[PDB]
């Protein structure tokens, strides 16, 4: 589909036709709770969908584990694996085998169902871990940890397949079709015949690039992005109609192949990161096609000049977008900007598992795109796509969510200095935006004086002497980064065939040359780097100085701002004016606060700056993506932070961010206030995303400060199921 999102999101959460499970993709178990249906839009596709329930206590019942549910998906995605590589082998006896790990399924499915009681069998994630009834669920799941440790041994014995094998293919048949995931529910404070909803889209497509170094048509380092979804949060209003309050991208995870590092020579490390830029191209893709979703027939049409509009568009609706989408793109220069608000750590000395490479190679890869063009692919309708350049801009940042995030003087567990140079720079970039889109809508506001005297504030310290020697040099890269890019593909195309296959001579000259530029890109990198730090410094005692103030006055722009803004008289237009720009000055200047004051890694700030810098690119208007080593833990909650964030604010009287939903410190009570009541909602869509990915529930993420969030880490556990061998 190449169909509107707004248009698709309210399809989707529509009367759907149901599924019987025979015909799923695959198991995600909790029949009756997660339901399978078709898409209504795309053939072959499916949707999975959740209803929060709640018992007398209005504590949920839903998105909550089992790990009898838990084992029946284990068992049934590890044998659904099983059965595809049996299928597919050299090997005989295809039969005799397949019939054998069904039998084993069945009967290791009885023997849980025989030994596990069903009401030691559940969790409850919104109490403490430690209660009689959850050490209970811990010894169930130790339990059912060693059956599945029998079962899948002896799977791997009667399928004549590796462990690591099984693994790999239970990743590439969910890989080949990835449903649609959403969690509806009743947000605290909703309105009557109303309901909030959360969605995962599964997006990317392969750049045609990618499609012909794949022995395809337009073992080790594969190609392609994945865990790259578009997530989707909003309100259904009382007749089916949707509200959208938040859109930006899960993942991509990492847009290197990780696994390939291991013990490699300087060749295979240049390969890595041309995977990276290769991937990077892709995600350029998606993110136009993020922007075409984003306009409605009306807004294509608005863009296409007079003059070349037909007299009449096609009586077929999909046939006359598409031909919209095709003169639309025809005429009209694209330009794209990604905020990837990377949350790994970079610095990591143990278990780093390429944490350093992660955050250097993606932010050398968005930088070498960066100010230029791609050429890209845009699907138009369901047989036609058309090509073009399409314009790049990064803003990346990185900074740690672990145990690792910020160590003390000395501690050789990790170096937190590793980031500190592109976070300082993004600081600096994200700021200036945000001053640039200040002076562009002070316009609209006149009879709002106290707007003026926030942006005179804002407007920091006079540092424009700088800011102009930075774009001097950053226009000086283009040409060497152009030539890096290009030269960077050919060493990949070389490197890709066989050593069998290979002239060792080529392979060199593209190698130095890539060096070369590196080499050269490194040094203005630095000096640029330099200048950035020089600002930072003005910035930040400007900050200190002026801090009482900034906040006395974003409090008086609210006082005189709200009261309009719930004016029961005052045009939808008027009213997003004035919380976009009083947005933008509430999440810019709450990053200051955590950033220059150095605050952001205290335990109880936990994923605080990262979220207000999603946040800021999201009102800003960039694609926000987002994102740890497969995206699975870390990056599943900074999601559920900004997504929780934005329903929160745009539930309020005002739609304005007062910071309660990150503030509020959790207390696991059996009463608890509205914005733990929400968070309450928030984990189950990052269950339905495990195991999708997976096989089976997770997120496994080590919760750092517990009043950091409503629910206690029990998925973690069952997410270790992923990883038994």
């Not at 991509?252 to 041309?274: E, H, T, V």
């Not at 990346?396 to 980031?419: C, H, I, K």
């Not at 640029?528 to 930072?536: F, S, V, W």
Request: glycine share 6%.
């Amino acid at each position: 589909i190449t169909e509107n999102i707004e248009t698709y999101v309210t399809h989707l959460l529509s009367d759907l036709e149901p599924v019987p499970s025979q015909n799923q993709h695959l198991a995600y178990g909790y029949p009756g709770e997660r339901q399978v249906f078709k898409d209504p839009m795309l053939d072959g596709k499916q949707v999975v969908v959740v209803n929060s329930q709640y018992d007398k206590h209005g504590r949920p019942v839903t998105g909550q584990p089992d790990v009898i549910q838990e084992a029946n998906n284990y068992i049934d995605n590890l044998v659904a694996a099983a059965k595809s590589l049996i299928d597919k082998d050299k090997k005989g006896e295809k039969d005799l085998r397949k019939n054998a790990i069904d039998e084993m399924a069945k009967t290791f499915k009885k023997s849980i169902s025989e030994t596990i009681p069903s009401d030691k069998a559940k969790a409850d994630l919104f109490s403490s871990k430690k209660s009689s009834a959850n050490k209970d669920f811990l010894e169930q799941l130790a339990k059912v940890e060693g059956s599945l440790q029998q079962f899948t041994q002896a799977v791997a014995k009667a399928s004549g397949h590796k462990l690591k094998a099984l693994d790999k293919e239970g990743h590439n048949i969910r890989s080949h079709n990835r449903d649609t995931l959403i969690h509806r529910f009743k947000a605290p404070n909703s309105k009557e015949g109303e309901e909030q909803f959360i969605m995962y889209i599964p997006c990317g497509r392969y750049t045609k690039r990618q499609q012909r170094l794949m022995g395809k048509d337009e073992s080790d380092l594969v190609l392609g992005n994945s865990s790259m979804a578009r997530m989707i949060a909003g309100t259904r209003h009382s007749d089916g109609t949707v509200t959208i309050h938040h859109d930006s991208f899960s993942g991509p995870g990492a847009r290197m192949p990780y696994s390939d590092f291991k013990g490699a020579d300087d060749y295979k490390k240049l390969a890595i990161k041309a995977v990276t830029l290769i991937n990077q191209e892709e995600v350029i893709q998606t993110l136009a096609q993020r922007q075409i979703d984003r306009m409605t027939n009306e807004d294509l049409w608005n863009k296409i000049p007079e003059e070349y509009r037909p007299d009449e568009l096609p009586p077929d609706a999909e046939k006359a977008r598409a031909q919209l989408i095709k003169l639309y793109v025809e005429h009209n220069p694209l330009s794209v900007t990604e905020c990837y608000t990377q949350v790994v750590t970079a610095g990591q000395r143990v278990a780093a598992e390429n944490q350093k490479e992660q955050f250097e190679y993606v932010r050398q890869m968005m930088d070498a795109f960066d100010g230029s063009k791609a050429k890209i692919t845009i699907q138009t309708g369901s047989n036609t796509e058309v090509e073009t350049a399409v314009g790049y801009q990064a803003r990346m940042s990185s900074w740690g969510v672990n145990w690792f995030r910020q160590v003390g003087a000395l501690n050789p567990l990790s170096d937190n200095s590793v980031t500190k140079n592109q976070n300082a720079r993004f600081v600096n970039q994200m700021t200036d935006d945000v001053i640039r889109n200040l002076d562009k809508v002070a316009q609209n506001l006149g009879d709002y004086d106290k707007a003026g005297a926030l942006h005179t504030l804002l407007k920091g310290p006079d540092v424009s002497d700088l800011n102009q020697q930075i774009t001097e040099k950053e226009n000086a890269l283009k040409e060497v980064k152009g030539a890096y890019r290009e030269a960077l593909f050919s060493y990949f195309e070389e490197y890709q065939k066989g050593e069998g296959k290979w002239d060792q001579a080529k392979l060199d000259q593209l190698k130095n040359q890539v060096d070369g530029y590196e080499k050269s890109i490194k040094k203005q990198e630095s000096a640029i780097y330099e200048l950035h730090n020089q600002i930072d410094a003005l910035r930040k005692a400007y900050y200190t100085e002026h801090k009482g103030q900034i906040n006395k006055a974003l409090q008086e722009l609210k006082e005189q701002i709200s009261p309009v803004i719930q004016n029961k008289e005052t045009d939808p237009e008027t009213k997003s004016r004035l919380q976009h720009f009083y947005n933008s000055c509430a999440y810019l200047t709450q990053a200051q606060e955590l950033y220059y004051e150095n605050t952001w890694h205290h335990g109880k700030n936990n994923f605080k700056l990262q979220t207000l810098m999603a946040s800021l690119s999201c009102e800003l208007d960039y694609a926000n993506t987002k994102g740890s080593k497969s995206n699975n833990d870390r990056g599943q909650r900074l999601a559920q932070k900004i997504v929780g964030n934005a329903l929160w604010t745009a539930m309020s009287e005002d739609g304005l961010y007062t910071g309660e939903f990150l503030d509020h410190r959790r207390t696991h009570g059996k009463e608890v206030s509205n914005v733990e009541q929400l968070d309450r909602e928030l984990t189950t869509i990052q269950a339905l995303h495990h195991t999708a990915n997976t096989g089976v529930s997770g997120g496994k993420f080590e919760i750092q400060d517990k009043a950091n969030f409503a629910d206690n880490g029990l998925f973690g556990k069952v997410a270790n199921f992923a990883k038994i061998k």
